[PDB]
Design a protein around this ligand. Structure first.
Ligand SMILES: NC(=O)[C@@H](Nc1ccc2c(c1)OCCn1cc(N3C(=O)OC[C@H]3C(F)(F)F)nc1-2)C1CC1
Length: 898
């Protein structure tokens, strides 16, 4: 109990709320989550102590590897006859004298071969499984037998033409530094009739009693609008109450819905709102699951605390809004009464559903020609023609925002068994289902049950707000379990954490998958913790994420202690920036910096801000602060530029100073998503042998409009260049930074990076570019900063990155008529190739954005905001028509040239 009390305080500090607040929650679902989720905690700990110390080392330092060992042609061609020059460092003499041994080995060498070759070279100057390779400068290790080139550091070194520097370290020097953490089960581990839904022979009705806390400006006549939803799909007509004055919100009225109680799908929800009156307007909204976590249909009296309308939603109901009561009890509260059946009504078991499904398939197989003719949703087996099979393949290639007509819905459903042969059609088939028909849904269940597995990126769509059904989401998660690699889990983690908000219940298959992975991979565990923590201010998800964080913190081990260092450092930084903006905002930079340095140097603050792991990359150790290098930036929201020593023995070989931008006041979530997408686009380009180097720098939101930005070394804004002006000033600067034989490499890098950002910003519809948000590296690498805006952030498509004379001059190597040059023609060709490459992967990009609708991002609120990408990628047009469209967008913007 003394250890439990201390641990509870550590978790309380990490989550930012006391654990006891959970213990007080009366809700049985909350207490069942807390207890039942501990098996995932147990399993994860069991896997970590399966092959100790190695399995523990693998958890803390997982291999940072690529998804595939195969190297793209242009990347393999960068190697000398398939071989790589590698530097291996050995610390041998006292006072840590560093010895280097240059090796030329095959790119696909296992670390054990790399170590033996180093020992051979060390011996040539005068066991193999008693050492490990570590990346010089950071806590990155090569613990698993992967081809060398598969580790991201090595692949990055080949792609950039940099020398890989690895340090030989004794296994026991790492192992002894890994503490044993025994996971202890918490105190809380130790805890009429019943009829099936398909037996209740009655129509659906819900009684609306009255409303409390309806404080409005005497707004006049008010009513409650209700609807039965399955995701966003209405299951019946919307039913409103009689109009009443806001001075007395009383209805005591039964609302009858056009839906049979046995027809109710598992994910059925009641969507309601208090509206005012004809200019109708919602005032407060709220959603309810018609079945609880135990599969029980709602019965009796219930009070629902409503939510405020979001600036932009003109619609009277909010089905894609959060489901459940408002944690704030000083809000419009609507009392509702549910139907009584003199027994507990439960959703039928899978065996009842399977029996009913097989009864229907059998009944349908016996249907005569004329019977099949009564419904377009009923087709015959032998009547399936090749043209129909062709139409099916065509429908399957359409994007997730392509409208499926009622005719195609009936078509896909009648050919559902053929659909199994083309399994990627599953999301379209699911939207074709009559979710308000138990016969159809029961049959869909059995098809999902045995559905062929699909690509993890295709399965992710099935986890968004369009697919609420648990059988469907279970299938999506099973595909992620079988085919999602840790690399790709890390890449899409923000979306996967987002879609948790769409789960009906706290205890679900997705959360179990995500938690097991977070507790079996510390690299995943780290970002899992921060994505959840950053949203703990948001009362729409703070209970779910709080309980999720509590389970993670109980089983993560020693990393909780390290996370508490990062949390405390972030809090001290939030504290300082908050004082500067409320108590020192009007003072001079000199005065503000004087205050900063004095507050930072306080021993309590000084220690909290030194000797912790970078939340941007936990493999990066933040040593002592370099205060002389710390400063308040002139930028909006006055961000802090912070510098730390890299305590790593071989810091000089990576970077001797870790520079991070701490910014308080701006929502860094859109930037995080844009940067994530930029990286995905780059990966797509590289795989197709199209070397357009992007700079997706690190960015992490750590709270409500608080975050970290990775500083890019040796970079300057376009304005910073020209301020030392002619159009030749930038090209003059580049020529000055890359004199002689290396000048062409810089022009090539600029052109390539420039083509990437032209295409990326045009597709995504990023905020207008200017000399202060376009940056350039000494070597010529062009990149964009400040991704605060994207998509339709105006009210018809924009070109955010318009190439001025400055950019065209660099591309054309200093020519006057830069538009009419071969260099510019090769530049245009890179844009065309890049644009069409992304167009080919549009479903992915649409899916990545759709999974982000749950998030409170102001530019990504509806599917129509995502529609912007359908327009920029010209998906309704042909490929040549799309190329023609892009050229017109470029030609109009640049007033010619394209
Ligand atoms: N050139 C410079 O002034 C300095 N180097 C620099 C500055 C800013 C960023 C950067 C590098 O790395 C790229 C990432 N980055 C991103 C941002 N920002 C951004 O995305 O929004 C505004 C701005 C800020 F102020 F928030 F950092 N700034 C930088 C150099 C003198 C030391």
């Amino acid at each position: 109990n003394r250890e439990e009390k201390i641990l509870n305080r550590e978790i309380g500090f990490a989550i930012g709320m006391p654990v006891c607040e959970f213990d007080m929650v009366k809700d049985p679902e909350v207490q069942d989550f807390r207890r039942n989720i501990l098996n995932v905690c147990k399993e994860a700990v069991d896997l970590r102590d399966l092959n100790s110390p190695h399995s523990r080392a693998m958890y803390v330092y997982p291999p940072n590897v690529e998804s595939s060992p195969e190297l793209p042609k242009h990347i393999y061609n960068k190697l000398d006859k398939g071989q790589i020059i590698v530097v291996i460092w050995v610390i041998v003499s006292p006072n840590n004298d560093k010895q280097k041994y240059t090796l030329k080995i095959n790119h696909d060498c296992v670390p054990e071969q790399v170590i033996a070759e180093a020992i051979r070279k060390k011996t040539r100057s005068m066991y193999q499984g008693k050492y490990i390779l570590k990346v010089c400068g950071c806590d990155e290790y090569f613990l698993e037998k992967y081809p060398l080139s598969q580790y991201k550091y090595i692949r990055s070194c080949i792609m950039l033409g940099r020398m890989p520097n690895l340090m030989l370290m004794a296994k026991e020097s790492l192992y002894s530094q890994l503490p044993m953490d025994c996971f202890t089960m918490p105190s809380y581990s130790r805890r009429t009739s019943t009829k099936s839904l398909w037996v209740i022979n009655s129509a659906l009705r819900i009684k609306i009693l009255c409303a409390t806390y309806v404080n409005v400006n005497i707004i006049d006549k008010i009513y409650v609008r209700t609807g039965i939803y399955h995701g966003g799909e209405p299951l019946c007509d919307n039913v409103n109450t009689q109009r009443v004055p806001c001075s007395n919100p009383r209805w005591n009225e039964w609302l009858n819905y056009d839906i049979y109680i046995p027809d109710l799908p598992r994910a059925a929800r009641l969507c309601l709102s208090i509206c005012s009156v004809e200019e109708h307007c919602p005032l407060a909204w709220g959603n309810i699951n018609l079945f609880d976590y135990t599969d029980t249909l709602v019965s009796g009296k219930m009070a629902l605390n409503l939510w405020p309308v979001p600036h932009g939603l003109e619609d009277l109901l909010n089905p894609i809004g959060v489901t459940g009561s408002n944690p704030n009890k000083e809000t419009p509260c609507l009392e509702l009464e549910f139907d009584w059946f003199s027994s507990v009504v439960k959703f039928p078991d899978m065996s009842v559903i399977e029996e009913h499904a097989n009864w229907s398939v059998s009944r349908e197989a016996g249907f005569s020609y004329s019977h099949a003719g009564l419904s377009n949703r009923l087709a015959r087996d032998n009547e399936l023609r090749e043209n129909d099979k062709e139409q099916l393949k065509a429908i399957s290639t359409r994007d997730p925002l392509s409208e499926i007509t009622e005719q195609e819905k009936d078509f896909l459903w009648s050919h559902r068994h053929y659909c199994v042969t083309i399994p990627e059609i599953l999301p379209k088939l699911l939207l074709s289902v009559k979710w308000n028909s138990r016969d159809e849904v029961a049959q869909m269940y059995c098809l999902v049950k045995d559905w062929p597995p699909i690509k993890p990126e295709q399965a992710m769509e099935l986890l968004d707000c369009n697919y609420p059904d648990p059988m469907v989401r279970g299938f999506a998660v099973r595909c992620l379990e079988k085919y999602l690699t840790d690399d790709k889990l890390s890449q899409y983690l923000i979306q996967l954490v987002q879609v948790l908000k769409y789960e009906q219940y706290l205890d679900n298959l997705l959360v179990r998958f995500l938690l097991k992975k977070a507790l079996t991979n510390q690299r995943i565990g780290h970002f899992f913790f921060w994505h959840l923590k950053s949203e703990m201010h948001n009362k729409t998800v703070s209970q779910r994420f709080g309980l999720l964080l509590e389970s993670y913190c109980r089983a993560c081990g020693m990393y909780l202690k390290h996370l508490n260092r990062q949390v405390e450092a972030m809090e001290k930084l939030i504290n300082l920036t908050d004082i500067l903006k409320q108590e020192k905002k009007d003072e001079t930079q000199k005065v503000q910096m004087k205050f900063l340095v004095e507050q930072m140097r306080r021993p309590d603050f000084m220690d909290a801000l030194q000797g912790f792991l970078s939340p941007l990359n936990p493999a990066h150790q933040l040593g002592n602060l370099r205060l002389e290098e710390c400063r308040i930036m002139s930028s909006a929201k006055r961000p802090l530029w912070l510098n730390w020593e890299n305590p790593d023995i071989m810091s000089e070989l990576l970077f001797q100073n870790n520079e991070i931008i701490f910014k308080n006041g701006d929502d860094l979530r859109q930037d995080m998503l844009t940067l994530q997408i930029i990286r995905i686009m780059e990966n797509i380009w590289q795989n197709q042998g199209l070397d357009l180097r992007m700079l997706p720098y690190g960015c992490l939101s750590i709270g409500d409009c608080v975050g970290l930005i990775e500083v890019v070394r040796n970079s300057h804004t376009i304005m910073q260049i020209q301020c030392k002006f002619n159009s030749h000033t930038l090209h003059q600067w580049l020529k000055d930074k890359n004199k002689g034989e290396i000048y062409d490499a810089a022009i090539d890098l600029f052109t390539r990076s420039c083509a990437g950002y032209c295409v990326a910003t045009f597709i995504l519809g990023i905020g207008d570019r200017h000399n202060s948000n376009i940056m350039v590296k000494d070597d010529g690498q062009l990149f964009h900063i400040d991704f605060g805006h994207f998509l339709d952030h105006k009210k018809r498509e924009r070109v955010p990155f318009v190439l001025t004379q400055d950019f065209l001059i660099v591309i054309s190597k200093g020519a006057q008529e830069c538009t009419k040059t071969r260099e510019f023609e090769r530049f245009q060709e890179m844009c065309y190739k890049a644009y069409l490459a992304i167009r080919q992967h549009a479903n992915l990009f649409i899916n990545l954005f759709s999974m982000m609708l749950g998030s409170g991002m102001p530019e990504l609120q509806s599917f129509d905001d995502i529609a912007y990408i359908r327009k920029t990628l010209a998906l309704d047009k042909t490929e040549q028509e799309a190329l023609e469209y892009f050229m017109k967008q470029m030609n109009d913007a640049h007033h010619g040239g394209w």
